């Protein structure tokens, strides 16, 4: 019965240039969700 | 929501135990017997589960 | 109310248990 | 048969066939099983006590050791046969919530 | 015909009875020959409720029958031709709700004039609050309220303004038997003000500790009552007995009784209202052993609580869908 | 008078003066007296604060040319004359600032000014051939003398604030706040005059002064907004941020030491945490002060607020440097009261009890008194609580679902398909129901809320406001909303409630009532 922290809150489902971009899977296979783009643009955007 | 794996190999669940619908906190083996699992939840209950 | 300073025993006490 | 720790436990360990070690709250106490009995009860934290493991028979001047992490910043390590007397301890950069060893 | 001052510049001749005829007078003059009196009208409605608001507490020592049958034959007057015009008269009854709030908000209770006692009752009278949602006269309760539980009661002036408040809100549930937490907290309040003379129940937190009502009352049994009569309770709460008091003391606790045989049963935690008043009323019947009016509701609050059922609840059992 | 004042104006600076010099230099005097014999015997003079302007640039261009710069041979008169009629100039300005008795609005308001001007000219003007900015003698004289100038009432402004001193809220608007170095300078001269003993037994006195300058969020080692200079050469005042911090430490818990007052008192735990905790070296020290403010168990009735306030610093102290409180939900627990709904700072409080029940390691039985203490406080309460608590009780319920007993009981339901034993074994237990809930019961875990249920929000479920009785349908609703946006729920009052209400979606026409209550208005007609 103690104090504990929670690291964030978990926010589900993005809206995100007219996608329902989804909160449970991973980031670069969310970003792909979006019309026109791939998964080499989605993982070179989280890169940089 | 028991997922039991082998371990060094994620791509195989090896059986998924539906246990309460509340939160399963803690799940281990039995440290003699080898095929019982022993999950507590958030339901004030553990129950022992024959793999 | 206090009258005393702002000292720090709180911080030596819970150093000290 | 049920064993009164006062405080919500957090873990329960058992070190021999006969006791077995419960932390919750900011002490842990030992509990001799065969005589239902308390009979250590170590109090040296600050906060709760989170975690609990024991070590046997490896090389250590050390025969057995129980290490308990306490969302203070530390982890003890206490040894069971001269009373659960703490011996080592380390302090990380922020509460500890769960710990091990090989 | 009047434009909030020209009625006053108009009919500022007479006393009491030829108000309402010159009232009467301006409406057969618009009325009669409206081939186009719209704004006219809605405005002299308006004024009439300027008027009967700038009218009611100024000095209320001369002819008190004059005054009591001109204002309720002004009343019915106002309400019988208003019943047709709602949609203009309502528009000023919000403007003074928003002007009366700015009132509150630089003067800590000394803007409440006690004209406003009469708005609400007027407002109560023309429109019944059995709905849920109204365009006045629910900023009328939130505004009744925030002056329930956002003034210091410590005058008895301020006392005796809280209980003709609680009267008005029990004449608006009279009908929408709704529950105003708020007056809940003000029968705690008054009712452990009159005997706090503090070291038996601890959190209340009253404004005015010290006064309360002694050891020696008189247990006459004609004592009075609510007393419509808030400009002489204005010079009554400052040469002020314990007459008064126990006045206002015996009105709250009638309204209190009211409100428990009307509203409270029907609430389920109304065994959950009822033990801190029912421990300052023991507290009463226990100081005192005179007043048979706390042993009275004592019996019928025990009554109700041992004869109501009071189970856990099931809020959540939902039909399944299909 | 103002004649006199003129002509000595236009000889002082027509080209030069020996004895017309010595004759409108000690006219200050004279000037100085006669203010100090009309203060609050004229009052409204306007030739006083003329005076004070032209001596003051009368002394400016003394000290343009004939400042008491250096000297080379025999000028050993000239330089004494013009310090000691410059020196007088600063005192009786000086004295200008100590001696009003209200807002006079010249004799001090515009004395700061001169001194400040005085000394922002003198930072140049001297023997110094380097880069400094040394005021310190004339700003150690002007704080003691900003200090010692003690108005009637308006230091400590009993209701709420710090002081209502004129020139002293005109300092900190703009004599203090938008620069850098003369704050700096400003506490190192405060730091220096805590510490002879006459003066500090003087200075731990008007507080609130300090309290108006300082609770602003505009310091200069606050990284939000940062400012410019106005000083010529600035003397590595900027550079010791160890320094500025440092004693803004000392003075802050040394004058912190001193008469606490209640207002003030409070003021300082408002601002505890988000205006002074980040300008402390280590604010570990404030430790002890916040921790015995939060429990903090006084004969005063008004001494109850003070833990609530005391919260948020010694929560961001703990999560800082995880040190502790014991029993903290058991203190988390009593701190819960009939007071708490009533007061100025519930939303305050409430986005910090949203952290403390958010926690992953506390129980059901826990959470269960928080709610069930939270609903029978929330039955005798204003709206501005009511919609404040009961989205609590909502995100708590979703967050330990266990808690679900409390407004559904299973056992207490008849299905069409029983058993007669079943119904007459249902009947016979809600007779002999009674519920185990105890406010009397210090131990959140030892209460017996999960055991009780929960009728204070169905009580509440018929409110007489209807956005507010709508908000309490929920709990009759399913649960499909996940949480609600507490800091979105959080700070409706009564004003912007029926400033909402006035300002509301829609409008609909009023109606009116077939009732006819004709000579019985209330019952009190």
Redesign the interface.
Same mark, same amino acid.
């Given at each position: 019965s103690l104090v504990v922290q929670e690291q964030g809150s978990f926010q589900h489902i993005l809206r995100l240039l007219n996608t329902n971009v989804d909160g449970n899977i991973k980031i670069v296979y969310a970003l792909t969700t979006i019309k026109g783009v791939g998964r080499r643009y989605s993982n070179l955007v989280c890169k940089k | 929501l028991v997922s039991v794996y082998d371990s060094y190999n994620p791509r195989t669940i090896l059986l998924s135990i539906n246990a309460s619908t509340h939160p399963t906190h803690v799940t281990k083996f039995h440290t003699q017997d080898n095929k019982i699992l022993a999950t507590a939840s958030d339901d004030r209950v553990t129950r022992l589960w024959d793999i | 109310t206090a009258t005393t300073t702002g000292t720090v025993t709180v911080i030596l006490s819970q150093a000290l248990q | 048969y049920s064993l009164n720790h006062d405080q919500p436990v957090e873990n329960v360990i058992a070190v021999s066939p006969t006791q077995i070690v419960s932390c919750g709250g900011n002490n842990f106490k030992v509990w001799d099983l065969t005589s239902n009995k308390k009979l250590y009860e170590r109090g040296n934290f600050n906060k709760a006590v989170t975690c609990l493991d024991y070590v046997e028979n490896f090389d250590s001047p050390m025969q057995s050791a129980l290490i308990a992490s306490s969302l203070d910043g530390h982890v003890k390590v206490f040894d069971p046969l001269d009373n659960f007397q703490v011996k080592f301890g380390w302090k990380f950069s922020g509460p500890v919530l769960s710990c091990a060893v090989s | 015909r009047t434009h909030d001052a020209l009625l006053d510049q108009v009919k500022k001749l007479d006393l009491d009875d030829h108000p309402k005829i010159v009232k009467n007078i301006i409406k057969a003059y618009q009325p009669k020959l409206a081939e186009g009196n719209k704004e006219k009208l809605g405005k002299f409605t308006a004024v009439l409720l300027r008027h009967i608001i700038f009218l009611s507490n100024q000095n209320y020592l001369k002819n008190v029958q004059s005054f009591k049958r001109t204002q309720?034959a002004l009343?019915?007057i106002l309400k019988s031709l208003?019943?047709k015009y709602?949609?203009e008269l309502?528009e000023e009854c919000?403007d003074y709700?928003?002007e009366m709030?700015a009132r509150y908000?630089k003067n800590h209770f000394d803007a409440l004039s006690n004209g406003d006692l009469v708005f609400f009752?007027?407002i109560?009278?023309?429109? *019944?609050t059995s709905?849920?949602?109204?365009?006045?006269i629910? $900023?009328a309760?939130?505004?009744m309220? #925030?002056f329930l539980?956002?003034i210091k009661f410590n005058s008895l002036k301020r006392i005796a303004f809280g209980a003709?408040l609680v009267?008005?809100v *029990?004449?608006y549930?009279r009908i929408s038997?709704?529950?105003? $937490?708020?007056v809940?907290?003000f029968f #705690?309040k008054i009712l452990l003000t009159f005997i706090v003379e503090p070291l038996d129940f601890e959190?209340?937190?009253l404004d005015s500790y010290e006064l309360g009502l002694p050891l020696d009352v008189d247990f006459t049994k004609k004592r009075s009552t609510?007393i419509?009569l808030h400009t002489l309770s204005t010079m009554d709460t400052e040469a002020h007995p314990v007459d008064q008091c126990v006045s206002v003391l015996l009105n709250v606790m009638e309204s209190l009784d009211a409100t428990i045989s009307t509203v409270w049963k029907?609430?389920?935690?109304?065994?959950?209202?009822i033990l801190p008043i029912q421990q300052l009323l023991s507290a009463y019947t226990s100081k005192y052993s005179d007043f048979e009016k706390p042993r009275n509701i004592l019996n019928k609050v025990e009554k109700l609580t041992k004869f109501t059922?009071?189970?856990?609840?099931?809020?959540?059992?939902?039909k399944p869908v299909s | 008078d103002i004649a006199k004042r003129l002509t000595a104006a236009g000889d002082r600076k027509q080209y030069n003066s020996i004895i017309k010099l010595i004759n409108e230099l000690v006219i200050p005097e004279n000037v100085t007296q006669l203010e100090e014999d009309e203060t609050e015997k004229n009052l409204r003079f306007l030739v006083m604060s003329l005076f004070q302007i032209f001596r003051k640039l009368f002394s400016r261009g003394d000290l343009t040319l004939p400042s008491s710069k250096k000297s080379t041979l025999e000028k050993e008169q000239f330089v004494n004359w013009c310090r000691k009629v410059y020196e007088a100039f600063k005192t009786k300005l000086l004295a200008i600032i100590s001696d009003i008795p209200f807002e006079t609005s010249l004799g001090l308001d515009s004395l700061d000014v001169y001194l400040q001007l005085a000394e922002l000219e003198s930072t140049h003007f001297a023997s110094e051939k380097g880069a400094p900015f040394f005021p310190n003698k004339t700003f150690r004289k002007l704080i003691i003398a900003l200090w010692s100038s003690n108005m009637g009432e308006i230091e400590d402004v009993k209701s709420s604030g710090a002081s209502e001193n004129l020139i002293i809220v005109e300092f900190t608007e703009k004599y203090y706040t938008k620069f850098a170095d003369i704050q700096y300078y400003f506490q190192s001269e405060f730091n220096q005059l805590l510490e002879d003993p006459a003066y500090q037994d003087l200075l731990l006195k008007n507080v609130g002064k300090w309290l108006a300058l300082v609770n602003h969020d505009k310091h200069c080692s606050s990284v939000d907004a940062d400012l410019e200079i106005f000083v010529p050469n600035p003397p590595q005042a900027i550079e010791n941020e160890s320094k500025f911090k440092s004693n803004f430490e000392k003075n802050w818990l040394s004058l912190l030491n001193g008469q606490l007052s209640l207002q003030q008192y409070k003021s300082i735990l408002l601002i505890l945490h988000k205006r002074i905790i980040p300008h402390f070296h280590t604010p570990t020290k404030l430790m002890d002060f916040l921790t015995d403010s939060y429990n903090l168990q006084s004969s005063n009735?008004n001494a109850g607020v003070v833990p609530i306030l005391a919260l948020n610093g010694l929560f961001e102290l703990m999560k800082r440097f995880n040190l502790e409180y014991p029993n903290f939900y058991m203190k988390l627990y009593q701190i819960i009261?009939?007071?708490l709904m009533?007061v100025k700072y519930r939303a305050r409080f409430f986005r910090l009890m949203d952290v403390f029940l958010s926690s992953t390691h506390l129980s059901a039985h826990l959470v269960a008194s928080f709610i069930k203490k939270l609903a029978?406080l929330?039955?005798?309460?204003?709206?501005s609580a009511?919609v404040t608590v009961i989205p609590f009780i909502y995100n708590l319920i979703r967050k330990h679902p266990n808690c679900?007993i409390?407004?559904?009981?299973?056992?207490?339901?008849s299905n069409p398909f029983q058993t007669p034993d079943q119904v007459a074994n249902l009947k016979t237990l809600?007779e002999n129901?009674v519920?185990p809930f105890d406010v009397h019961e210090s131990d959140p875990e030892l209460t017996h809320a999960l055991d009780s249920?929960?009728?204070?929000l169905?009580?509440?479920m018929?409110?007489?406001?209807?956005n507010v009785?709508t908000l309490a349908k929920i709990?009759?609703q399913?649960?499909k909303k996940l949480s609600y946006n507490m800091e979105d729920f959080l700070d409706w009052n009564?004003?912007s409630?029926?400033n909402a209400?006035?300002s509301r979606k829609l409008?609909?026409?009023?109606?009116?009532?077939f009732?006819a209550?004709?000579?019985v208005?209330?019952?009190?007609?």
């Open positions: - | - | - | - | 309720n009343i019915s208003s019943e709602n949609r309502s919000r709700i928003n709030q908000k009752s007027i109560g009278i023309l429109f *019944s709905d849920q949602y109204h365009l006045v629910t $900023p309760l939130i505004l309220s #925030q539980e956002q003709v009267r008005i *029990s004449q549930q038997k709704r529950y105003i $937490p708020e809940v907290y #705690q959190n209340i937190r609510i419509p029907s609430l389920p935690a109304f065994n959950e209202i059922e009071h189970i856990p609840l099931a809020l959540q059992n939902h | 009735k009261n009939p007071d009533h029978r929330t039955l005798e309460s204003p709206p009511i679900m409390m407004l559904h009981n299973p056992a207490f339901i809600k129901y519920d249920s929960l009728w204070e169905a009580s509440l018929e409110h007489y406001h209807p009785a709990f009759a399913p649960f009564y004003d409630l029926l209400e006035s409008k609909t026409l009023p109606t009116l009532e009732e209550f004709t000579n208005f209330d019952n009190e007609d």
